[PDB]
Write a protein that binds this DNA or RNA. Structure first.
Ligand SMILES: [Mg+2]
Ligand SMILES: [Mg+2]
Ligand SMILES: [Mg+2]
Ligand SMILES: [Mg+2]
Ligand SMILES: [Mg+2]
Ligand SMILES: [Mg+2]
Ligand SMILES: [Mg+2]
Ligand SMILES: [Mg+2]
Ligand SMILES: [Mg+2]
Ligand SMILES: [Mg+2]
Ligand SMILES: [Mg+2]
Ligand SMILES: [Mg+2]
Ligand SMILES: [Mg+2]
Ligand SMILES: [Mg+2]
Ligand SMILES: [Mg+2]
Ligand SMILES: [Mg+2]
Ligand SMILES: [Mg+2]
Ligand SMILES: [Mg+2]
Ligand SMILES: [Mg+2]
Ligand SMILES: [Mg+2]
Ligand SMILES: [Mg+2]
Ligand SMILES: [Mg+2]
Ligand SMILES: [Mg+2]
Ligand SMILES: [Mg+2]
Ligand SMILES: [Mg+2]
Ligand SMILES: [Mg+2]
Ligand SMILES: [Mg+2]
Ligand SMILES: [Mg+2]
Ligand SMILES: [Mg+2]
Ligand SMILES: [Mg+2]
Ligand SMILES: [Mg+2]
Ligand SMILES: [Mg+2]
Ligand SMILES: [Mg+2]
Ligand SMILES: [Mg+2]
Ligand SMILES: [Mg+2]
Ligand SMILES: [Zn+2]
Lengths: 181, 83, 69, 118, 23
RNA sequence: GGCGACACACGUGCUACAAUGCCCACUACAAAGCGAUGCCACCCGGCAACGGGGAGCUAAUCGCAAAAAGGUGGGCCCAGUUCGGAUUGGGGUCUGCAACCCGACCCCAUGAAGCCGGAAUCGCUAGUAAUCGCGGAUCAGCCAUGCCGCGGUGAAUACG
RNA sequence: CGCCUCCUAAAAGGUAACGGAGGCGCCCAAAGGUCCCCUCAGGCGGGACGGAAAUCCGCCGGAGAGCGCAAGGGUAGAAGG
């Protein structure tokens, strides 16, 4: 397995501090990191364009994994969308690729956001998970201004083994998630 | 605006009112016509009834309205709308 | 891991304007950025930018006082 | 995000390209060139990376720009609107603030004409 | 044009002086 | 305090929509006027408005006063742009007892509509039209892009 | 005016009225055979554009979903994807 610094840091500085703060008696009680799911609800590629290919190529470069197409479950007139048409993309990152992506996000992606003042501390799921929303894709290091044709955002789902928000919050700040006061 | 080589202008008849209040029971209701008088930090806390040309409007002074003039807080025209 | 559909990841470096070098794996073996986590103002404590005076909007000027008290 | 999170256009001179940043005008686009030792006659596409990084650092350290400036302006307008200032009242209704006539003209504030029955 | 205060032409139109139209 | 309002409608104008142009530096060439609680040379300080000293002139003597379009050189290269300068935020100067309603000007930032205008309608026959600047009355100051004057450059066409 | 479903119909079947309610006169080349895999509707909380409602994540939820078209029967230990 690739020696990622973020995974190294979790096992060296984060795990011993977590057991200090919360007093887990089992080495498997301490919250772990399960997976990261990145979803792109395009919605503009229903029938007006097959521009899913442009976003699939960009998403594969950022995460190293080719994403999968998600189709509409039903037809809605107000969105002018039919059942079964492709209206999104999704990629799931686990193990080494999960650690690699978060290291880039915390270090070279989030600092490039316009007027960054920290992450939302009230976005915790309530059972130990976190979700954040991005408006721009050019903040990632592998994306340059030249091949950017349209602006696109994404939702990032961070899933942990923590049971409560307070234990999931502690893991994330030590890992490097910066939060607003 | 006024030049900083000159001091900020107060009519000296309302300044006497707030100053005399500040050492003699400093809270009452003053009626004034000096809309051109500039609010002073000492005036904070007072309720001043400022003429709009027809009536005295009560204005309660706070910190973030210190450098303005009293007349800016008593509108002189009633509009609502057309129709 | 399916074959032929995933960009192969290679060891890579990301160089920031402040000289910071972050070591990771990416699809591009050399990346340059303009801001990183070690120089962004929100991360280095406060790093007060061109705005640092707290807006000084209160009576904190004293506006002379050369007039009569 | 090249300078202050914005992309100044290529094929234009540096002084002309700098003015494309919210909060940077021609006067500041000359000041930022007379304090970083860079020729205004050159194009942005032809710049040494040292020049670009030094110019970016100096510009982002000297002047409040872009979203921070917008926040400052909006906060000032909110301060005027909240305290019941006359300028605040005219900011609520979208009417001219600097004492212009409103019987005619005043179209930049009021928008398109809304003809009624006379 | 003549409506711009930050030019020689505009200052001439307004009949004033300054940085852009020195005396 | 109002005559300065503001869902709208009309008249008269000003500024533009650009390369027969815009910006920057240097460099020419007028006329008619005004000036003693006035006109202010020159020097100093501030990017500047302007402020502090301070001559000369009751003025064919001294000042306003710089004329501008022009000429030379450079920059911009067809874009809502180095076109256009409305609106708004901030910092200031001056007049005035006092610039909030409701003054003018300087500097920084903001950089709206506008790509030559529907039915229609106006002026002008020669130093005229067009275009460029300058002075005066009222006036502490000025909302003058108005009015009354002055000169610079200088057309087209009239068959009938 | 023939055919299908429910009630009337009196707990086997059958049972009338110009009694009470609804459908059919098709369709599918896969909506057929088999093998393999999978499991809903809904509610609550979180998430760029994005909402009552698009796509994504977590939790509860045993069939209240779905099964081309009426109704009834049946059905997730599948007949549903
Ligand atoms: Mg969890
Ligand atoms: Mg700019
Ligand atoms: Mg009138
Ligand atoms: Mg008005
Ligand atoms: Mg008329
Ligand atoms: Mg007109
Ligand atoms: Mg005009
Ligand atoms: Mg422009
Ligand atoms: Mg211009
Ligand atoms: Mg006034
Ligand atoms: Mg437009
Ligand atoms: Mg054009
Ligand atoms: Mg007409
Ligand atoms: Mg004639
Ligand atoms: Mg006019
Ligand atoms: Mg029969
Ligand atoms: Mg039949
Ligand atoms: Mg029976
Ligand atoms: Mg039986
Ligand atoms: Mg029976
Ligand atoms: Mg019978
Ligand atoms: Mg019978
Ligand atoms: Mg019958
Ligand atoms: Mg019957
Ligand atoms: Mg039926
Ligand atoms: Mg039928
Ligand atoms: Mg049939
Ligand atoms: Mg068939
Ligand atoms: Mg079938
Ligand atoms: Mg079947
Ligand atoms: Mg059912
Ligand atoms: Mg039917
Ligand atoms: Mg059924
Ligand atoms: Mg069922
Ligand atoms: Mg089951
Ligand atoms: Zn850095």
């Amino acid at each position: 397995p690739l020696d990622v610094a973020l995974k190294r840091k979790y096992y060296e500085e984060v795990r011993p501090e977590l057991i200090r703060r919360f007093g887990y008696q089992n080495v498997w009680e301490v919250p772990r990191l399960e997976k990261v799911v990145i979803n792109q609800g395009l919605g503009e590629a229903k029938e007006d364009a097959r521009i899913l290919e442009k976003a699939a190529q960009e998403l594969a470069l950022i995460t190293g994994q080719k994403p999968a197409v998600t189709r509409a479950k039903k037809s809605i007139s107000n969105f002018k969308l039919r059942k079964g048409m492709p209206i999104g993309l999704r990629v799931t990152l686990r193990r080494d690729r999960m650690w690699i992506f978060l290291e880039k996000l915390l270090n070279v992606a989030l600092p490039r956001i316009r007027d960054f003042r920290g992450l939302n501390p009230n976005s915790f799921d309530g059972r130990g998970n976190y979700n954040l929303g991005l408006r721009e894709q050019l903040i990632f290091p592998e994306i340059t201004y030249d091949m950017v044709d349209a602006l696109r955002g994404m939702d990032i789902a961070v899933v942990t083994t923590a049971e409560t928000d307070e234990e999931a919050r502690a893991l994330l700040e030590l890992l490097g998630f910066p939060f607003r006061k | 605006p006024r030049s900083l080589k000159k001091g900020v202008f107060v009519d000296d008849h309302l300044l006497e009112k707030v100053l005399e209040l500040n050492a003699k029971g400093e809270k009452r209701l003053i009626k004034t016509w000096s809309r051109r008088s500039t609010i002073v930090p000492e005036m904070v806390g007072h309720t001043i009834a400022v003429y709009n040309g027809k009536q005295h409007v009560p204005v309660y002074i706070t910190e973030n309205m210190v450098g303005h003039k009293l007349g800016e807080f008593a509108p002189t025209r009633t509009y609502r709308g057309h129709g | 891991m399916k074959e032929g559909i995933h960009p192969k990841l290679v060891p890579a470096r990301i160089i920031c304007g402040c000289g910071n070098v972050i070591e990771t794996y990416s699809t591009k073996p050399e990346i340059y950025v303009e801001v990183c986590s070690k120089c962004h103002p929100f991360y280095t404590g406060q790093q007060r930018f061109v705005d640092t005076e707290g807006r000084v909007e209160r009576f904190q000027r004293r506006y002379g006082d050369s007039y009569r008290k | 995000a090249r300078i202050a999170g914005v992309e100044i256009p290529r094929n234009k001179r540096v002084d002309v390209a700098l003015t494309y940043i919210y909060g940077i005008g021609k006067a500041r686009a000359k000041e930022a060139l007379e304090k970083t030792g860079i020729n205004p006659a050159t194009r942005v596409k032809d710049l040494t990376e040292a020049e670009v990084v030094r110019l970016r650092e100096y510009v982002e350290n000297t002047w409040k720009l872009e979203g921070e400036l917008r926040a400052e302006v909006a906060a000032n307008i909110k301060r005027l609107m909240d305290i019941g200032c006359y300028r605040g009242l005219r900011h609520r209704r979208g009417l001219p603030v600097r004492g212009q006539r409103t019987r005619t003209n005043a179209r930049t504030r009021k928008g398109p004409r809304k003809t009624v029955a006379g | 044009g003549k409506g711009d205060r930050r030019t020689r032409r505009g200052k001439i139109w307004r009949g004033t002086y300054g940085k852009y139209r020195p005396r």
